[PDB]
């Protein structure tokens, strides 16, 4: 029984340009657990990215949080690239500071 990841890209604190924040990509509801998650700054992977320990929900589906320390600007584009066995193509979700 397999399940496609849900994705939410967002920040720990409301985006104040030039202030330091955290960029979060939260993937939930997937199965099996092996997942490929990257944070992108202008199409380029960010190296120093950490993530929480693997757990799962009442319906056995897994969730992880990926996060990196960042400082939003007016112009920099950020995203989250996710691949999974269930995804024939990677999903790339753009950061939006409003959701």
């Amino acid at each position: 029984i397999q399940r496609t990841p849900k994705i939410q890209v967002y920040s720990r604190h409301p985006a104040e340009n030039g202030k330091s924040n955290f960029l979060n990509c939260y993937v939930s509801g997937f199965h099996p657990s092996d997942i490929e998650v990257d944070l992108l700054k202008n199409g380029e992977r960010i190296e120093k990215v950490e993530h929480s320990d693997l757990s799962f929900s009442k319906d056995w589906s897994f969730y992880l949080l990926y996060y990196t320390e960042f400082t939003p600007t007016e112009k920099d584009e950020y995203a989250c690239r996710v691949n999974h066995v269930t995804l024939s193509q990677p999903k790339i979700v753009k950061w939006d500071r409003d959701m």
Binding site: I1, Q8, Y10, R12, S52, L54, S55, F56, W60, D98
Partner: protein
Amino acid sequence: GFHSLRYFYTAWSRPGSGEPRFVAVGYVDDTQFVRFDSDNASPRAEPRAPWMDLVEQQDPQYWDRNTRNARDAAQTYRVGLDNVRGYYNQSEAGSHTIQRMYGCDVGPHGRLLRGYDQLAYDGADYIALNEDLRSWTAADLAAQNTRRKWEEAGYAERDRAYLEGECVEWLLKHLENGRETLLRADPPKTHITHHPISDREVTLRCWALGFYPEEITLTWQHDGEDQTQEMELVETRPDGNGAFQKWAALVVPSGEEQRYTCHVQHEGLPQPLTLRW
């Protein structure tokens, strides 16, 4: 009120890429406090909550006693993966997963309320401890095998004894040592934002930030008329600092923003909030 100590185990094969991996985590209520990852060189259980730093002085043996258990668990589920796949006669080339979710709920009485021990295989229910803490409910033919060996090995009784003693005792210790983190209810920081779609439609988004515990309700009301099906509600999500966030949004006509209200309920709130743009 009630609280819960839980343990989540994940074990899965990686055909080709090496031996099976076993990751276990533990939670009190809605916050992790320990972890164990079999892919470490000499893997040990580790603290994942600041209040766990003072666990050694109440009982230093904690970390060794735990590490030994995690290592053994790790072995038990490696062997399990092989027997279960064998029951099904599945090709060794496919990855497969065994899960586990056991713990206890205790209440204002400081006595148990529910114990549980449940297993999934490839993400579906496989076998679970019945609420009587003595029989097992097997999901399919292959899980009868697991049940029979577990019946004969007396594992239900091993579970009941743990769930009704050690589990309760430790859930109470943790609540005591984690009293600042664990016995709080941080109400959400709420506000509303405003994003114009066109000149005749505008998106209202109602934000709940930095709250704990996870359980929360957010709704929109149009002149006191609930708007649940008309609204977009995101899954609750962690902020990375031990709290949670959530929003609800809905599109309203570009002059009737004033006629909508967001309603917020949460354990930390003395009364439920009503917000308006």
